[PDB]
Amino acid sequence: PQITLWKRPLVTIKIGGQLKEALLDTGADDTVIEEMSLPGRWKPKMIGGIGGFIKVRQYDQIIIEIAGHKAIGTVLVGPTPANIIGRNLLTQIGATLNF
Amino acid sequence: PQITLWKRPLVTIKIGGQLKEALLDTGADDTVIEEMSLPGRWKPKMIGGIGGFIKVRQYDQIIIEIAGHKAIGTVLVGPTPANIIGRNLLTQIGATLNF
Ligand SMILES: [Cl-]
Ligand SMILES: [Cl-]
Ligand code: NA
């Protein structure tokens, strides 16, 4: 698709067999999702946002579908105000910004 | 241009007679710049995201040039960790996300 930005670029994702809404975020290095259960072991990570820093759980090699496009990569889980798809997965699905 | 997302999508902007670097951020509703002077009236605002909220000054009808493209809109000024061009100005330069 070609997604304009008059509204927030929200898409449906599928993770763990469940559908969720998430924001396509070119200003995010990483993908961050609200609390949910993911398999395997996690590693610690500190991330920064407009307000300061939060601690998250880093899960690697997670299967995730983004607007119908398959990806497998790192997902951070923590107290984000919104589910965000960052550049680590935007690159996997071939996303570019154009103007 | 077409901008890939292998690295942060930073561009040069001209605002307030000043050149700055800023991040093209589809996950931001609004444009937020580090402390600087702008002309005109302003009013206070709180904006939020991953580590909570910060207080900014809201200036309306500010002319900006973003990678060579002129636009006008609201610019928020305050202690942001990064200069960000959000959707309110991305739309004006015709920016889309494509995949
Ligand atoms: Cl505006
Ligand atoms: Cl348009
Ligand atoms: Na003004």
CSV table of C-alpha atoms and ligand atoms in Angstrom, one decimal:
chain,number,residue,atom,x,y,z
A,1,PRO,CA,0.0,0.0,0.0
A,2,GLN,CA,0.7,3.7,-0.1
A,3,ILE,CA,-0.3,5.2,3.3
A,4,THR,CA,-0.9,8.9,3.7
A,5,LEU,CA,-0.5,10.6,7.1
A,6,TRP,CA,-3.6,12.7,7.5
A,7,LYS,CA,-4.6,10.0,10.2
A,8,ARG,CA,-2.3,7.9,12.3
A,9,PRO,CA,-0.9,5.0,10.3
A,10,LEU,CA,-2.6,2.2,12.2
A,11,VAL,CA,-2.5,-1.3,10.9
A,12,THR,CA,-3.5,-4.7,12.1
A,13,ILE,CA,-0.7,-7.0,13.3
A,14,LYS,CA,-0.8,-10.7,14.3
A,15,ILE,CA,1.4,-11.9,17.0
A,16,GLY,CA,0.9,-15.1,19.1
A,17,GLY,CA,-2.2,-15.9,17.0
A,18,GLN,CA,-3.9,-12.7,18.1
A,19,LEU,CA,-4.8,-9.6,16.2
A,20,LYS,CA,-3.7,-6.2,17.6
A,21,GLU,CA,-3.6,-2.7,16.3
A,22,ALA,CA,-0.2,-1.0,15.9
A,23,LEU,CA,1.3,2.3,14.7
A,24,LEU,CA,3.8,2.3,11.8
A,25,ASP,CA,6.5,4.4,13.3
A,26,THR,CA,9.5,5.7,11.3
A,27,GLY,CA,10.7,7.5,14.4
A,28,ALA,CA,11.1,4.3,16.3
A,29,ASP,CA,14.3,2.3,16.1
A,30,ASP,CA,12.5,-0.8,17.6
A,31,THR,CA,9.1,-2.4,17.8
A,32,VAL,CA,7.4,-2.1,21.2
A,33,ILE,CA,4.2,-3.7,22.2
A,34,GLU,CA,2.0,-3.6,25.3
A,35,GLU,CA,2.1,-6.4,27.9
A,36,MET,CA,1.4,-9.8,26.4
A,37,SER,CA,2.9,-13.3,26.8
A,38,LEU,CA,5.7,-14.3,24.3
A,39,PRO,CA,7.6,-17.6,24.3
A,40,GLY,CA,11.2,-18.1,25.2
A,41,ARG,CA,13.7,-16.2,27.2
A,42,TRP,CA,14.0,-12.4,27.3
A,43,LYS,CA,16.8,-9.9,27.8
A,44,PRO,CA,16.7,-6.5,29.4
A,45,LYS,CA,16.6,-3.3,27.4
A,46,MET,CA,16.1,0.4,28.3
A,47,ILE,CA,14.5,2.6,25.6
A,48,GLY,CA,14.0,6.3,25.4
A,49,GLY,CA,10.9,8.2,24.2
A,50,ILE,CA,9.7,11.7,24.3
A,51,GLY,CA,9.1,11.6,28.1
A,52,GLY,CA,12.1,9.7,29.3
A,53,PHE,CA,13.1,6.1,29.5
A,54,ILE,CA,11.4,2.8,30.2
A,55,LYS,CA,12.5,-0.8,30.9
A,56,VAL,CA,11.2,-3.4,28.5
A,57,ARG,CA,11.6,-7.2,27.8
A,58,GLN,CA,13.4,-8.0,24.6
A,59,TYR,CA,12.3,-11.2,22.8
A,60,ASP,CA,14.2,-12.2,19.7
A,61,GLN,CA,13.1,-14.0,16.5
A,62,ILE,CA,9.3,-13.6,17.1
A,63,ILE,CA,7.0,-14.3,14.3
A,64,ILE,CA,4.8,-11.3,13.5
A,65,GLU,CA,2.5,-10.3,10.6
A,66,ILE,CA,2.3,-6.6,9.8
A,67,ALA,CA,-0.6,-5.5,7.5
A,68,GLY,CA,-0.4,-9.0,6.0
A,69,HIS,CA,3.3,-9.0,5.6
A,70,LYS,CA,5.4,-11.7,7.4
A,71,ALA,CA,8.3,-10.7,9.6
A,72,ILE,CA,10.4,-12.5,12.2
A,73,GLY,CA,12.4,-10.3,14.5
A,74,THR,CA,12.8,-8.5,17.8
A,75,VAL,CA,9.8,-7.4,19.8
A,76,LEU,CA,10.1,-5.3,23.0
A,77,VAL,CA,7.3,-5.7,25.5
A,78,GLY,CA,6.7,-3.1,28.2
A,79,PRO,CA,4.7,-0.1,29.3
A,80,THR,CA,4.4,1.7,26.1
A,81,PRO,CA,1.3,3.9,25.6
A,82,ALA,CA,0.8,2.3,22.1
A,83,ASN,CA,1.9,-0.6,20.1
A,84,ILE,CA,4.6,0.6,17.7
A,85,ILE,CA,6.2,-1.0,14.7
A,86,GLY,CA,9.7,0.4,14.4
A,87,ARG,CA,12.4,0.4,11.8
A,88,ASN,CA,13.7,-3.1,12.6
A,89,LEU,CA,10.4,-4.6,11.2
A,90,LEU,CA,9.5,-1.8,8.8
A,91,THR,CA,12.7,-2.7,6.9
A,92,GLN,CA,11.7,-6.4,6.8
A,93,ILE,CA,8.4,-5.6,5.1
A,94,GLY,CA,10.1,-3.3,2.6
A,95,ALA,CA,8.7,0.0,3.9
A,96,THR,CA,10.0,3.4,2.6
A,97,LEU,CA,9.1,7.0,3.1
A,98,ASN,CA,8.4,8.8,-0.1
A,99,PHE,CA,7.8,12.4,-1.1
B,1,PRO,CA,12.9,11.1,-2.8
B,2,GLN,CA,12.5,7.6,-1.4
B,3,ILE,CA,14.0,7.2,2.0
B,4,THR,CA,14.8,3.8,3.3
B,5,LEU,CA,14.7,2.9,7.0
B,6,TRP,CA,17.9,1.1,7.5
B,7,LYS,CA,19.0,4.1,9.5
B,8,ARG,CA,17.0,6.9,11.2
B,9,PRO,CA,15.4,9.1,8.6
B,10,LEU,CA,17.0,12.4,9.4
B,11,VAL,CA,16.7,15.4,7.2
B,12,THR,CA,17.8,19.0,7.3
B,13,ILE,CA,15.1,21.6,8.1
B,14,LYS,CA,15.1,25.4,8.1
B,15,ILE,CA,13.0,27.0,10.9
B,16,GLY,CA,13.2,30.3,12.5
B,17,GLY,CA,16.1,31.2,10.3
B,18,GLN,CA,18.0,28.3,11.7
B,19,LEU,CA,19.2,25.0,10.1
B,20,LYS,CA,18.5,21.9,12.2
B,21,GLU,CA,18.5,18.1,11.7
B,22,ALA,CA,15.1,16.4,12.4
B,23,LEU,CA,13.6,13.0,12.3
B,24,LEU,CA,10.8,12.1,9.9
B,25,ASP,CA,8.4,10.5,12.4
B,26,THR,CA,5.2,8.9,11.2
B,27,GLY,CA,4.5,7.9,14.8
B,28,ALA,CA,4.2,11.5,15.9
B,29,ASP,CA,1.0,13.6,15.6
B,30,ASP,CA,2.9,16.8,16.0
B,31,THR,CA,6.2,18.5,15.2
B,32,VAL,CA,8.5,19.0,18.2
B,33,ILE,CA,11.8,21.0,18.2
B,34,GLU,CA,14.4,21.6,20.9
B,35,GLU,CA,14.5,24.9,22.6
B,36,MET,CA,14.6,27.9,20.2
B,37,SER,CA,12.9,31.3,19.8
B,38,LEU,CA,10.0,31.6,17.4
B,39,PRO,CA,7.8,34.6,16.6
B,40,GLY,CA,4.2,35.1,17.6
B,41,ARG,CA,1.9,34.0,20.4
B,42,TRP,CA,2.2,30.6,22.0
B,43,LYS,CA,0.3,28.5,24.5
B,44,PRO,CA,1.4,25.7,26.8
B,45,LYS,CA,0.8,22.0,25.9
B,46,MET,CA,1.6,18.6,27.3
B,47,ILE,CA,2.6,15.9,24.9
B,48,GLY,CA,3.3,12.3,25.7
B,49,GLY,CA,4.7,9.1,24.5
B,50,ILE,CA,7.0,6.4,25.7
B,51,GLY,CA,8.4,7.8,28.9
B,52,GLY,CA,5.4,9.9,29.8
B,53,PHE,CA,4.8,13.6,29.1
B,54,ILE,CA,6.7,16.8,28.6
B,55,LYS,CA,5.6,20.4,28.6
B,56,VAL,CA,6.1,22.4,25.4
B,57,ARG,CA,5.2,25.8,23.9
B,58,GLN,CA,2.8,25.6,20.9
B,59,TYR,CA,3.4,28.1,18.1
B,60,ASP,CA,0.9,28.2,15.2
B,61,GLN,CA,1.4,29.2,11.6
B,62,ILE,CA,5.1,28.6,11.5
B,63,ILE,CA,6.8,28.3,8.1
B,64,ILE,CA,9.3,25.5,7.8
B,65,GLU,CA,11.4,24.0,5.0
B,66,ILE,CA,11.9,20.2,5.2
B,67,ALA,CA,14.4,18.8,2.9
B,68,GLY,CA,13.7,21.5,0.4
B,69,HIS,CA,9.9,21.4,0.7
B,70,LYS,CA,8.1,24.4,2.2
B,71,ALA,CA,5.2,23.9,4.6
B,72,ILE,CA,3.3,25.8,7.3
B,73,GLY,CA,1.8,24.6,10.5
B,74,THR,CA,2.0,24.3,14.3
B,75,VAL,CA,5.5,23.7,15.9
B,76,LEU,CA,5.9,22.7,19.5
B,77,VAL,CA,9.1,23.8,21.3
B,78,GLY,CA,10.5,22.2,24.4
B,79,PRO,CA,12.8,19.6,26.0
B,80,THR,CA,12.4,16.9,23.4
B,81,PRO,CA,15.3,14.4,23.2
B,82,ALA,CA,15.1,14.7,19.4
B,83,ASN,CA,13.8,17.2,16.8
B,84,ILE,CA,10.9,15.5,15.1
B,85,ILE,CA,8.8,16.2,12.1
B,86,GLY,CA,5.4,14.8,12.8
B,87,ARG,CA,2.3,14.1,10.7
B,88,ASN,CA,1.0,17.6,10.8
B,89,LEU,CA,3.9,18.7,8.5
B,90,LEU,CA,4.6,15.4,6.8
B,91,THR,CA,1.2,15.6,5.1
B,92,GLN,CA,2.1,19.0,3.7
B,93,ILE,CA,5.2,17.8,1.9
B,94,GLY,CA,3.3,14.8,0.5
B,95,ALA,CA,5.0,12.2,2.5
B,96,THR,CA,3.7,8.6,2.3
B,97,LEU,CA,4.7,5.3,3.7
B,98,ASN,CA,5.0,2.6,1.0
B,99,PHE,CA,5.4,-1.2,1.1
C,1,CL,CL,-0.6,22.1,12.0
C,2,CL,CL,-2.5,13.5,0.0
C,3,NA,NA,1.8,32.1,15.4
